[model samples]
Target chain A: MRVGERFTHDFVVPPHKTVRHLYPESPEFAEFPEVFATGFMVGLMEWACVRAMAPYLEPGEGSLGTAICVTHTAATPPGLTVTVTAELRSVEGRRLSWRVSAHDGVDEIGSGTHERAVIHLEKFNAKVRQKTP
Target chain B: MRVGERFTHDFVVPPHKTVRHLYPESPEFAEFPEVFATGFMVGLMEWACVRAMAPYLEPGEGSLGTAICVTHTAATPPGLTVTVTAELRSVEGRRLSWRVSAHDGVDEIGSGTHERAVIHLEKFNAKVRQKTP
Candidate 1:
């Protein structure tokens, strides 16, 4: 994919996606206020990036999130919509790099750099199987 | 809290914690293998750090994950126990930083730096409410 390519995605914050739901069994987590979980924020960042790269992926090829560096600066409560924007920053061989950020209507909640590796699913699955029984 | 404090947490990979379960409603994500997701990896890392800091936190105080930088290098399938080890590398006033890593039986799956801020729940809640309706 060409560098500088970008994509934006938006989704409403559901109660189930809050910090309390990230590890509901853990009372410690449940004690936290109902806000967007950083974990899910990271996932949505990847999803937006993946959608941006979809057209470039060949048949049998997919991408895996390999690295991330981000800062979650604001707290976003449930019922708000979050917009994640991903920008293609670089492509080196099979590696793709992106600059991403998220805004929760009222504030800029997070921003970061992320990397993904494009791989043949069949090959990737076989290699992962080697680590299993 | 003193620097150099450390903690380790272990949890078996469950089907619900896999990539497919991260966004089951999305057919694109459903196509992914049933392995631990990077999103949850970041969460476990934070949880371990929080546990490490629990004793140092006073009543009405809790920590919020502020930043994360990690590389997910390997995949772990369900049923395998993954251990997350976190070390307190620095403490800057209300900010806490850690160097963390995860191992899934067969290989070192991920590692990175993370940051959190200690805050009074009462004050935090008030501020968050200001951002809401």
Candidate 2:
């Protein structure tokens, strides 16, 4: 609905985290990098923001996110906890905008603006089908 | 140099790809999401672009990338072959710029501009130490 109406989630930064190898070094899973893949980070933030605004939508009314403009400013080394916050900043009819950020205990690591448009799930899937076939 | 002088690498998009889970669902891993974390995707594209321009730099001279501006335009569903390409387009003193894009065999999924500034590795790490300590 508006910028001030939103939620924030505290995301823990796991240890020995390095983008070094996308996969965890050990099968036993001794680290967190495996849990926070780059794309997954984006998705997590995206999902968190959407969940924050879910209550504001009408029944059977939800938006399919279409675009994201973001910057991953700093590297969150292992062992540091990062806090990610999302704010719903605008709403013009079915279009919505959000201001989001992520911080590692002491420093700002990332921030960006994301946009999503309201759509019916069935209709959206049908459009995809038409486009594909 | 210009954009045409850059190098291109063919990346095969493995099958059954889904961002559904950041980590491979299984220990041995039958999927590729773990290999292509969102951040890792950005890093891989960034690294490929830098490697393309490596030959243009003096021995022992390289830049620690300071920023990246990118867009994850499409959901790269698993099993689709995606090709990512990089082109060095501009150089002014120690600053270099490149144009990059990722495509799934059928359509262009993502594209963007990336910027990097050249610096000595030892000096760069020294600055990091000073800032941290």
Candidate 3:
């Protein structure tokens, strides 16, 4: 557990990664025109936080996301580069918490916190495999 | 394998799942505190979308998140019932895409797109196991 750990990463909001290109059918979403979808933003947020937590884990150790608290404030268009920053806030047993935020050159597009739980790779695989019929 | 499947689920925003409680160290987050975390929303999004695609997958098959693009626009507090809805958008070989949205009784809290890929559990497990040094 590495409390206080931090990390950052950036990516261009590509066409395939945009809200409209991914889901062209819904009029509700279509009504919003085109911009970065918050669902993709959530994954971007996770990519940043998980990398920030990597240094704290041992070989075969990994994390499973459990909770998220975030907001998508601004609408950033495709091709714009967005940066995601995260800080590990706490490390209690297997539970880890993080504060995460994102900015698209012009403005802050997202902000929030997240939680992930540590697990052994083998054990985690076993647990997921059990979902099979 | 779930190219044309769909699923829905509902849950209440609990105290432990709030943004402030998950990352209490940040003042920026505290300013507009006490809403569901976007981080948790991602997991919730995954839970719903994956389940909806369940029938399309073979028994030992699973999915790993590859991308997401969603927007969380509203503030929801504790005890509010939030419903997540997902529809299969495309299935190209092993790649799967979905249209997802969530609503609190009073507002549409989320809308976006997500992508996941089908995986053979045993093979995926092997890949993870190799990460051990």
Q: On DockQ, who's better, 1 or 2?
A: 1
RMSD of each: 1.3, 6.4, 16.6
- The local lDDT score (0 to 100) that residue B89 gets in candidate 3 is 90
> Candidate 1 A-chain TM?
0.95
* Model 1 DockQ (Cα-based): 0.69
Query: Which regions of candidate 1 fall more than 4 Å away from where they truly are?
Result: none
Find the candidate with the highest TM-score and give its number: 1
| lDDT of predicted model 1 | 0.88
- Could you tell me the lDDT of residue A77 within candidate 2? 49
DockQ score, prediction 2:
0.21
Best by lDDT: 1
Residue A123 local lDDT, model 2: 58
* Model 2, residue A88: C-alpha shift (Å): 1.9
Which ranges in model 2 have alpha carbons more than 4 Å from their true place? A23-41, A56-65, A92-94, A117-133, B1-6, B15-17, B23-41, B56-65, B92-94, B117-133
- Report the lDDT tens digits of candidate 2 across residue range B1-133: 5655656655554432233334333221222222233444455565666567667777656653444456654544444566768887788888877777776666666677667677665555454444341
Tens-place lDDT digits, model 1, residues A68-128:
9999999998888999999999999999999999999999999989999998998888887
* lDDT tens digits by residue: candidate 3, B104-123: 77778878777777778676
Interface DockQ per candidate: 0.69, 0.21, 0.04
> What CAPRI class is candidate 3?
incorrect
